[PDB]
Amino acid sequence: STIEEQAKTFLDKFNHEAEDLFYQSSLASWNYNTNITEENVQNMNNAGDKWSAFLKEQSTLAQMYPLQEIQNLTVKLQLQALQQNGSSVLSEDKSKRLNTILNTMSTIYSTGKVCNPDNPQECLLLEPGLNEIMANSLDYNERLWAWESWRSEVGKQLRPLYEEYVVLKNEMARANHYEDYGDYWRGDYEVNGVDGYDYSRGQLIEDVEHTFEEIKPLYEHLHAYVRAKLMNAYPSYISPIGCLPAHLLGDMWGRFWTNLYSLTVPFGQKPNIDVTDAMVDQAWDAQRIFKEAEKFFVSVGLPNMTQGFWENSMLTDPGNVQKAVCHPTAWDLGKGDFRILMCTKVTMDDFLTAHHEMGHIQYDMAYAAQPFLLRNGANEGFHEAVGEIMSLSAATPKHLKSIGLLSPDFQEDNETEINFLLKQALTIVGTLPFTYMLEKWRWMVFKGEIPKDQWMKKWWEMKREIVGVVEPVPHDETYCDPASLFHVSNDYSFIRYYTRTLYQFQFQEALCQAAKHEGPLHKCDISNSTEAGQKLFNMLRLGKSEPWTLALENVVGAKNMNVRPLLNYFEPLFTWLKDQNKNSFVGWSTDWSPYAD
Template identity: 45%
Template sequence: MKLFGLLLGCGLSQTLDERVAILEDAVMQQHKEIDQLKQRLTKAETEISVLESSLTCGGAAFHDVCGCASGYAYYQGECVPSDEAAARAWIEEFNVDYQFYVHDASDAYFAYETNITDANLAAAGAASARFGAWYSAHIPHAIRVFDWKNFEDPLLKRQFSKLLGNSNSLNAEDSAALNNAMNNMNKIYASGTVGDADRCVYLEGAEEGGVALEGIMANSLDYNERLWSWLGWRTNVGDALRPHFETYVEMKNKWAQVNGFEDYGQYWRSDYEMPEDNFNDMAVTEYEKIEPLYVQLHAYVRYRLGEVFGNDIFDQDDGLLPANVLGDMWGRFWTGLNQFVVPYPDAPDVDVTEELKAQGYDAKKMFQLSDDFFKSLGLERVNEIFWDKSVIERIPDVEMVCHPTAWDLGNGEDFRIKMCTDINMDYLLTIHHEMGHIQYDMQYAWQPPQFRDGGNEGFHEAMGEVMAMNVATPEHLRAIGLLGPAGDEETEYQTTINFLMFQALQQVATMPFTIMMENWRYASFNESITTDEWMEKFWQMKNEWVGVKAPAERTEESADPAALYHIANDYSMMRYYSRTIYQFQFQKVLCDACGHTGPLYTCDVYQCEAAGDKLKILMGKGSSQYWLDQLHEFTGDDEATMNADGMRDYYQPLMDWLVAENSRLGITPGWDASKTEYHPFDENMDFVGKCAENKAAPSVKPLPFADFIQQYIKA
């Protein structure tokens, strides 16, 4: 009836193409409704089964025998084995099919993110529905039959905990609201552009001969162009994200609460398995060790940026840095500022971008260089599937999500990376970071799916970072022919300070950004910050913690935090904070294994198989063991915990240099968040321009959100 009505309603004035489009939309809607009915039917059948079991057993608990012999439980009209041996056999069989369905769905999602079309959208939705139907049909057996919380085998108990520990679901209405919010945030972020009369600009992965917003934020010498880019992204993306982000926070809190948590922030912190939920307190305490270095770095950067963009912008009484001049769209990493703040411009430059280009590096050659690095440690090379299936450059004339991500597609052999590589130092380090994720994935591939993750979320991120920090050393860059030979003692000192500055712009600068962002989210989830003051409190915290201000006044209509990929896509940020500390602890262990002597910042573990042997053991454990136990074994220290002492010591030469240089320049470090001032700007900037004709309606369609896949994608 719906299709017949649509045919009558088309009218003779419409073209054949228009009528076909209307019919196609109607067919897709009917398929969607059929899928929803199938899911409701599966859920109803499960509920009936559970009810029958409860009634037959007179309301007894699921693990009671209900007239069955010892070691059996009543389920779906019969007595089935319920002891640990049966549980072990059940989960082994379950995992065979689980890997198939996860791979099926992950493959479809990868295809969609690398080629955003209606056909790929439909395929991803269908694959997600197949997984959901299979999962819903099988998981009630484990819930009803096995008393897993009382298992004697600790590994089996941990495995079931990973599978079932947070298995309660939202009701249908709330689940639909969450999925809709996540789908729309995905769509808005992926299709975001900023335009003016002459151009329509993507965030990253510029078209041939063009520029990306990230390129503007890293390289433009025009303060107002950076402001246009910064404000445009938050106007076109942040404003649109706001209502969906509010729904996301509300529904994620509801989900956390039905699974026994006070709020979603507490659920995230549970990844660290701290009995008193005090991991955030530990994280803040460790930052206090690094904060003095950050304050000195902030002051020096402020002075140098004043020379570039004008002291009238930077001589204001507040001492705050405008957020639009910090090297990327969010001020998360300051490596784009190296060209402006390098301490010794005449000393060898550890940013080897120009050398990469001079030597003819392309994306594949950069990835092969990274693969060689891992092989030199005695670790695994990536397989042919990786080279065949990965997408490492923007595909011409195809809309895709360019944000770099490493994918474990769930079957133990299919690993891929998706990114739009540019030929520069930042991307060289990003490649090693993402390949670090892939190496971790390969090393724990022998584990059951429930344990295919890092010891905690920060371990996985740290593994990528520790590889990148080795590659960035002058020692390594010389070893692979991207940096000239060492000079005299004075030249080497200057090269060292340049190197430590380059590293600090990424590692030190990101720490207050990340810990502040996560504490804002924790406060938003626990409602100590209410929705009507989100932006106000966000920028207050940004001013106070980070010494950074918005370049223009912000309002509650926007959602500046969500204009970052990780926030819009439901990633915890604590993983990126804790990894920055872990990587120095990991590096110390690896360098000791290699017999390194001298300062840690001179260590490069390239070609050291002893380091690889240590890494194999740690990575191979996956999440099968509590992270502190893993850290104790890896370091050989039974008292080891997350500790920033190593990071502070690593940067001591730079700290000494910054204190002396700031004093020489007459710079007073610090800022006053109570005196925020804004530089005048053109309030009639155009943020749409040519984008109106290029993308009158975003071509990106909402992708069905699937929590189960996120474990396998590292950003």
């Protein structure tokens, strides 16, 4: 009689009908990625539209069950996502024009290219063409030509398409009773209905801003060290208290500094840990690479992989006849069908990536018993965070020596680990400032605090203050830097990468306390320890059915994000960088520019 019985009935029949259409929609995309054919391209659109229109048809009946009469927390969470109308709230024109802007901006990104200034005939596309050249390019002009010319025909041309994306997406948030479109993404962390665990959407701006203050002393030292090694190349453009060029970050957007690890090696007289030459002599293939990782999850207590998982895996690309995307991805369809599509070579990274790609599949097995709408991570940062903790355990010399990759007589000391922390710091400490910088800028533009003319004026003004990077060539409001980015042009969450660093480290410190490991954190290894797996398995099966604030307390015992695990794991590196920076100036100034003298 009560609306509760009617709501639970609508939710029971929705999981069955949605599981069949969702599985066929994901299955169609699998055959399309594994094999490029005219039949798979159409099946992805038909199966994709059938499932896309399914939620639109169910959303009409979901708004007829108010959440005020529902006293069940698990029931409101299932209807919380269905209550949203998506693009239905937008006008007929604004709703159809939105997909045209997303498809137009996404097409220019893949079709965009920059012709070689020295070779006008040869014109290389950004990916891989422009992303690979900028990685190993040490030239100042060669890197500036592709970096400066890209945003000229892209950033400038995408400005009118980006303006519509800002006005169109805002109309959707306002129809949803949201302060703005920026608050739309913060809704993933929204927590309500539980006394004391409530997490407001606006509290994210204060947490990300409060936690970033503690990372400054670690990043300032890491930035001063990188500027000292590269200061001998161009002392005029690189000031001691200034900032590093924007095109010298090692790649197009300067997201990860790992490419600079070669020249930033503190000690070149000592060997480095690599499994490439060790795996070659062992004569291992893609079939035994995943098998070795499957035994790791069993040592911690996690169930093994189903027979269909290993049988349906795609270990390589059979030439151009049948082509697939080598980009590692973990595909979860449904009905217990788990698969991974990746191109498997013999490298030290593929071994670490195998644990990451398998972490997503292993993570989907815990909450697989939850309802369709209840199957998901507690937030957007837990997806890749659970997979990083698995890779961090494999990179430790203790895990490598266990399976026999690294020689048992390999000497492990400060000089050996100091070089390892620097490699992980560039990929970790390097993305944090860039993530908080770009993510915070989008929140200000969407909120309306930055006029359209100040988009670029505030972009570089906040860049030197956050990441300490200055533009070699000044740009006007015509250019759009985020427009060229992959996540910004594809309408994907860019904040999930910032929180992933804080979440992956919290679990690393908590899981190692259960296994009773002593010494530095980077020396910890969760293998052979079945006590840490039982504690992490509890939250793995919860998913988003429970507030992420509550599930996080059962693991690390914290009700919010904390930078403490970031300082301890990087503590040994911070102590060494502090001494090497005594001869230099720690930090940078925002009053220095390469074109302003």
